[PDB]
Structure formats: structure tokens, C-alpha cells
Amino acid sequence: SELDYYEKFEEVHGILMYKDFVKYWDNVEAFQARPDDLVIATYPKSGTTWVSEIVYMIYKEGDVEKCKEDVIFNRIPFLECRKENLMNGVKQLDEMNSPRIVKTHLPPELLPASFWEKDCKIIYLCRNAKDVAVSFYYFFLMVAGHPNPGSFPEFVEKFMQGQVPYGSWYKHVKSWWEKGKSPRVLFLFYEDLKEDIRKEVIKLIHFLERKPSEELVDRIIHHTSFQEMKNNPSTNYTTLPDEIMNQKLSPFMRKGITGDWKNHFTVALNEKFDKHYEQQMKESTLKFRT
Amino acid sequence: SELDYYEKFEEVHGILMYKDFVKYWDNVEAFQARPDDLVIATYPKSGTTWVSEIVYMIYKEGDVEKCKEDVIFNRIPFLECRNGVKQLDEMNSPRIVKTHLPPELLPASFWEKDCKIIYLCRNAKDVAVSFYYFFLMVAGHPNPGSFPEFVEKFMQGQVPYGSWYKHVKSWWEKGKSPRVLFLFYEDLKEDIRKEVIKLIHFLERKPSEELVDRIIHHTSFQEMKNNPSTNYTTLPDEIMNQKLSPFMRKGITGDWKNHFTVALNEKFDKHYEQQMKESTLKFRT
Ligand SMILES: Nc1ncnc2c1ncn2[C@@H]1O[C@H](COP(=O)(O)O)[C@@H](OP(=O)(O)O)[C@H]1O
Numbered sequence: 060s061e062l063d064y065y066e067k068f069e070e071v072h073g074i075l076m077y078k079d080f081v082k083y084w085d086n087v088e089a090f091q092a093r094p095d096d097l098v099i100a101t102y103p104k105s106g107t108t109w110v111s112e113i114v115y116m117i118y119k120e121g122d123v124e125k126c127k128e129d130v131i132f133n134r135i136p137f138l139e140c141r142k143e144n145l146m147n148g149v150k151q152l153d154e155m156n157s158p159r160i161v162k163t164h165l166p167p168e169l170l171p172a173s174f175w176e177k178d179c180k181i182i183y184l185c186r187n188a189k190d191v192a193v194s195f196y197y198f199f200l201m202v203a204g205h206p207n208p209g210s211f212p213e214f215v216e217k218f219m220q221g222q223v224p225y226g227s228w229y230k231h232v233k234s235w236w237e238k239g240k241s242p243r244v245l246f247l248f249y250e251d252l253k254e255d256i257r258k259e260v261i262k263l264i265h266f267l268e269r270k271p272s273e274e275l276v277d278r279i280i281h282h283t284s285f286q287e288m289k290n291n292p293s294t295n296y297t298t299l300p301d302e303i304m305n306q307k308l309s310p311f312m313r314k315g316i317t318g319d320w321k322n323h324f325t326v327a328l329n330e331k332f333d334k335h336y337e338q339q340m341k342e343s344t345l346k347f348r349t
Numbered sequence: 350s351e352l353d354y355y356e357k358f359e360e361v362h363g364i365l366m367y368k369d370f371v372k373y374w375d376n377v378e379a380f381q382a383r384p385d386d387l388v389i390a391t392y393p394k395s396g397t398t399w400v401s402e403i404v405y406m407i408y409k410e411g412d413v414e415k416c417k418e419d420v421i422f423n424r425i426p427f428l429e430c431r432n433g434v435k436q437l438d439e440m441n442s443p444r445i446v447k448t449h450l451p452p453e454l455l456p457a458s459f460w461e462k463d464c465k466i467i468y469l470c471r472n473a474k475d476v477a478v479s480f481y482y483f484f485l486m487v488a489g490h491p492n493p494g495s496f497p498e499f500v501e502k503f504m505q506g507q508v509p510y511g512s513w514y515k516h517v518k519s520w521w522e523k524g525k526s527p528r529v530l531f532l533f534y535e536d537l538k539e540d541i542r543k544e545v546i547k548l549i550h551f552l553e554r555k556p557s558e559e560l561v562d563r564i565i566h567h568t569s570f571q572e573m574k575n576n577p578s579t580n581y582t583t584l585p586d587e588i589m590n591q592k593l594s595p596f597m598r599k600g601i602t603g604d605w606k607n608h609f610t611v612a613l614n615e616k617f618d619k620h621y622e623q624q625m626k627e628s629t630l631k632f633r634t
């Protein structure tokens with residue numbers, strides 16, 4: 060197992076990362092942003108795809124047709140993603156006409172300097188740690204490039220130690236929470252989108268300086284609902300071959316709820332996790348709902 | 350598959366039972382008890398072996414050498430198992446009888462002769478875990494399915510010997526009588542000395558520090574786990590594949606926390622309340 064992780068991951072700037080990405084990190088380091096670039100940042104499996112489609116719809120005034128012109132991972136390039144010449148986020152962005160929407164899972168400390176220098180707006184989305192752990196576990200099982208996660212308890216231990224891609228979820232959300240105090244960095248919660256999607260959609264429309272009409276909001280709401288996105292080949296990653304994403308084992312649009320952790324954490328693992336969580340987050344005003 | 354699951358079982362008087370036992374059930378119901386017979390009754394996986402060895406040691410005044418003259422399932426016949434009835438019929442008194450039968454199904458002869466009975470119960474969650482591994486390792490059992498699936502079966506009493514809830518509630522009522530000693534696995538775990546002394550007095554034996562000392566040492570989990578007379582290792586893998594899961598598995602209280610998800614635990618507790626809130630019987634998980 061530890062050997063598996065050693066083969067699959069490597070650190071960059073002290074953060075564990077997919078080895079393929081690290082090989083060409085210089086391209087990420089020197090990435091050139093544009094003033095109107097919009098960054099969507101998240102710790103893995105926090106609802107990136109969901110908010111990305113909401114944002115894309117807002118950019119297209121809710122035109123569903125314009126949102127299916129290409130798959131989501133081509134419409135919204137994954138900044139640091141690189142797999143030799145098979146996948147290249149920086150290349151996709153470089154050739155992309157503005158306004159560009161950039162997806163990234165990088166903690167603030169690793170975001171390319173250009174983005175800060177150009178004062179680009181950023182939307183950060185987070186989700187409670189327990190549900191993120193469950194979602195990430197299945198991701199490890201379905202997606203190529205990951206070591207065997209082993210049992211759920213084993214995987215959760217590594218999660219608690221930040222020994223997974225992008226490092227510590229705890230440090231990730233806390234660092235972005237600080238950046239979120241800024242007006243140009245909108246800090247959102249997955250659970251808030253679940254509880255009152257209308258409120259969050261209207262919040263996003265205003266953040267992006269667009270006009271919130273009843274018709275636009277309505278289109279966004281049903282189009283970005285879990286069931287619709289799960290069936291939408293543009294947003295469900297099903298165009299990817301099984302060797303890349305084996306959705307037969309687990310679909311990308313898995314369950315889309317808050318609280319699935321209760322179906323995976325044993326009572327003992329939950330007790331241990333909560334204790335560790337409290338130590339990690341006690342000194343923070345950031346509060347999540349499970 | 351439900352079909353494959355129940356193919357291994359057959360109901361007898363309302364409770365699911367190992368098909369082989371049922372074939373000879375008339376012999377069980379017609380069993381002839383003796384006045385000095387001692388019955389050790391338990392729902393499966395509640396510590397039967399543990400309390401059986403404690404009782405045997407008391408009968409043998411703590412003579413460890415005597416407790417190893419034969420394997421436990423021969424020293425203390427499993428009444429309804431088949432050949433328990435034969436072993437008992439051919440055994441000299443005083444006889445110690447092991448059984449997992451609810452009080453309503455205990456052979457009439459035992460009640461008619463007013464035999465002493467020791468009943469041992471354990472919290473439902475830990476019993477479910479212990480029983481789950483028993484299914485995986487013991488022949489005669491179908492695939493228990495996933496743990497959540499097995500727990501569902503357990504809650505519905507769709508396992509050998511039926512409803513744990515009805516089993517413990519009925520025996521609790523019988524336990525009100527001074528003739529039926531009602532014990533808890535958790536009590537043996539928390540203060541074995543207290544329970545051993547209680548057992549010695551119940552069995553009208555003279556307690557001594559030596560006797561108590563010997564029993565406590567001899568009946569510890571580690572000792573019994575390594576003792577071939579009590580760990581069921583003499584049975585071939587075909588009968589009991591302990592490579593999959595040993596009979597003497599963990600011997601603790603609370604292992605349920607390592608198996609029940611938060612969701613399953615919540616569902617189980619809700620169901621538990623509906624089944625037990627009217628009983629004065631109180632546990633500890
Ligand atoms: N429209 C939507 N509504 C709710 N959850 C959604 C969603 N689109 C994606 N998700 C969930 O977001 C997670 C994927 O996150 P990301 O896009 O950051 O990789 C998955 O969580 P689950 O695995 O818990 O179902 C997925 O089901």
C-alpha cells in the first residue's frame with residue numbers, strides 16, 4: 060500500500076500530488092492569467108462539477124445548448140492537470156478565448172502567482188470532511204492514477220493525515236477560509252447548495268455581476284440538479300473511457316447528497332474521526348454541517 | 350440469494366433451525382431429564398463456551414486436568430444438536446446440558462423436574478457480530494451476506510434459534526425464579542470474580558480462594574483460546590474453518606462499534622427500542 064502511494068503520488072511545494080502533474084509543474088508555476096479569468100477552487104470531491112456548471116450557465120445567460128457544445132472538462136480546463144500529451148490543462152487554457160473559467164484544487168499557497176497579481180475573482184467551494192472522504196474513496200477506486208485505497212477505515216486514516224492528493228483537507232479549507240474574507244473570493248458550502256440552491260445561485264449571479272431573472276434562475280436550478288447532471292454526458296464524465304474513469308465500478312455522479320458518511324463510517328471510525336477533527340479545527344471560525 | 354439462505358434452515362415451532370437438527374426433533378422433545386441435571390441456556394454466541402467451562406471447573410473443584418479429559422462439546426453435550434441426546438442419555442449424573450432453545454421449546458422434562466438452569470445473555474449488537482463471523486466460518490450456514498444484510502436478518506429473527514429479542518425476554522421472565530440464574534456476558538467481562546462467586550453459590554458449592562483463583566485464570570480468553578479442549582480446533586476445517594475466523598475471536602464487549610455504520614446503528618437502535626422498551630431487562634453495549 061505505502062509502495063502503491065509512493066509510485067502514484069509525489070510532493071510539490073510540500074503538497075502531495077498526482078505524479079503526472081508534478082512532472083510538468085513548471086508550466087503551472089508560470090501560468091499566465093488574464094484579468095477576467097474566473098477561478099473555481101475546491102478540495103477534491105467537494106462539488107466542483109456542480110458549481111462549475113452553475114457558473115457556466117450564468118456565463119451563457121442560461122443557454123443550455125451553449126453549455127453542451129463540449130464536455131465540462133474541456134469547457135472549464137483543469138489548470139494543473141497534465142498526463143504527458145494526453146491531457147494538458149495549461150495548454151487548454153492558453154488557447155482558450157477569454158473569458159476563461161479555470162478549475163483547480165490547489166490550496167491558496169500553490170495557486171499560480173499570476174492569478175493573485177491580476178486580482179482574478181475566485182469562487183471557493185467546500186464540503187464537510189466526512190462526505191468528502193466518502194466521495195474521494197470511491198474516486199480512488201474508479202479513477203486511473205490512484206493507488207488501491209484499501210478498506211474505508213484505512214483510506215480515512217490517510218485522509219486524516221493529509222496523505223492524499225492535494226494534502227490536508229483541514230489546511231486546505233482553513234487557508235481558503237482566510238482568503239474568503241476578501242470580496243473577490245466567494246466562499247461557498249456544498250451543504251448550502253443542497254439546502255437552498257436558489258439562494259446560492261442568486262448569490263453567484265450577483266458575485267459575477269449578472270442580472271438575476273426568475274427565468275434564468277429557474278433554468279439554472281433544474282439544469283444543475285443532480286438527476287439532470289447525472290444524465291448529461293457533458294457533465295457526467297461518461298465520454299471518458301473505462302481505462303480512465305471506470306464508472307461501472309462507481310459513477311462520477313454517485314449519490315449527490317449530504318450525509319452519506321453515515322452509510323460508510325463505522326461508529327468507532329466516526330468517534331476517532333470526530334476527535335481528530337476537533338483538534339484540527341478547534342481554532343477556526345469555519346463551521347461545517349454534516 | 351434468499352433461496353440459498355433458507356435452504357440451510359427449517360422452522361420448528363416457529364423458529365428457524367439448522368435443517369439437520371429438525372430431522373430428529375422428536376428425540377429432543379421427548380428427552381428425559383434428571384432432577385440434578387444442570388441446563389446452560391444461551392442465545393447463540395453469547396458466551397456459552399465461557400460459562401460452560403466455568404461451570405465445569407466448579408463441578409470438578411477447579412481440577413484443570415479433569416476439564417481437559419475430553420473436548421468441551423463432549424463434556425457438556427449440545428442437547429438439540431445432531432448427537433447430543435445420545436451423549437446425554439449415555440452420560441452419568443450429574444449432567445451438564447448445553448442448549449440455545451427458548452424456554453417455550455426446552456424439553457418438558459426439564460421443567461417437570463424443576464432442574465436448575467443458568468441463562469447467559471449478551472448485548473444484541475455484539476451477538477450479531479459474533480454470529481456473523483460464525484456464519485462465515487461454520488459449516489451448515491449459508492452466506493450471511495454483507496454485515497448490513499445479516500443485521501437485517503438478525504433484527505427479523507431470521508437466523509438459527511429465531512428472535513434474540515423474544516429469546517432474552519422469555520428467559521428474563523423465567524429468570525425471576527431463584528431456580529434460573531440469569532447472567533450477562535458484560536458482567537463476566539466487567540468483574541469475573543463477582544460472577545464466579547455467584548455461580549459457585551448458585552451451584553451450592555463451597556467457595557474458596559483457590560477455587561476462584563483457578564477458575565479466573567483457567568477461563569480467561571487467552572487461555573481458552575489456546576486450550577484445544579475449549580477452542581473447537583479439534584474439529585476439521587470442513588466442519589469449522591477457523592482459518593477464516595476463529596471460534597475464540599476477540600472476546601470483548603463493544604466490537605459492534607467496529608462493524609456497525611452510524612446509519613445501521615441508528616436503524617438497529619430504533620428497532621431495538623420497539624422490541625425491548627416494555628421489558629425490565631436492561632443491558633449494556
Ligand atoms: N448537481 C449536483 N448536485 C449534487 N451533488 C453533485 C452534483 N454534481 C456533482 N455532485 C457531487 O459532487 C461530488 C463530485 O465532486 P467534484 O465535482 O468536486 O469532483 C460527487 O459526490 P458523491 O460522490 O458524494 O456523490 C457528486 O455526486
Ligand SMILES: Nc1ncnc2c1ncn2[C@@H]1O[C@H](COP(=O)(O)O)[C@@H](OP(=O)(O)O)[C@H]1O
Pocket residue numbers: 391392393394395396397398399475478479480482568569570571573596597598599600601604
Ligand atoms: N473466556 C472467554 N472470555 C471472553 N469471551 C469469550 C471467552 N470464551 C469465548 N468467548 C467469546 O464468546 C463468543 C462465543 O460464544 P458461544 O460460546 O456462545 O458460541 C465469542 O465472541 P466474539 O465472537 O465476539 O469474540 C468468543 O470469543
Ligand SMILES: Oc1c(Cl)cc(-c2cc(Cl)c(O)c(Cl)c2)cc1Cl
Pocket residue numbers: 077078079080103104107142164202203204224303304
Ligand atoms: O477532480 C479531479 C481530480 Cl482531483 C483528479 C483527476 C484525475 C484523473 C485521471 Cl484519469 C488521472 O490519471 C489523474 Cl492523475 C487525475 C480528475 C478530476 Cl476531474
Ligand SMILES: Oc1c(Cl)cc(-c2cc(Cl)c(O)c(Cl)c2)cc1Cl
Pocket residue numbers: 367368369393394397449487488489490509588589
Ligand atoms: O453453538 C453452536 C451452534 Cl448455535 C451451532 C453449531 C453448528 C456447527 C456446525 Cl459445523 C453445523 O454444521 C451446524 Cl448445522 C451447527 C455449533 C455450535 Cl458450538
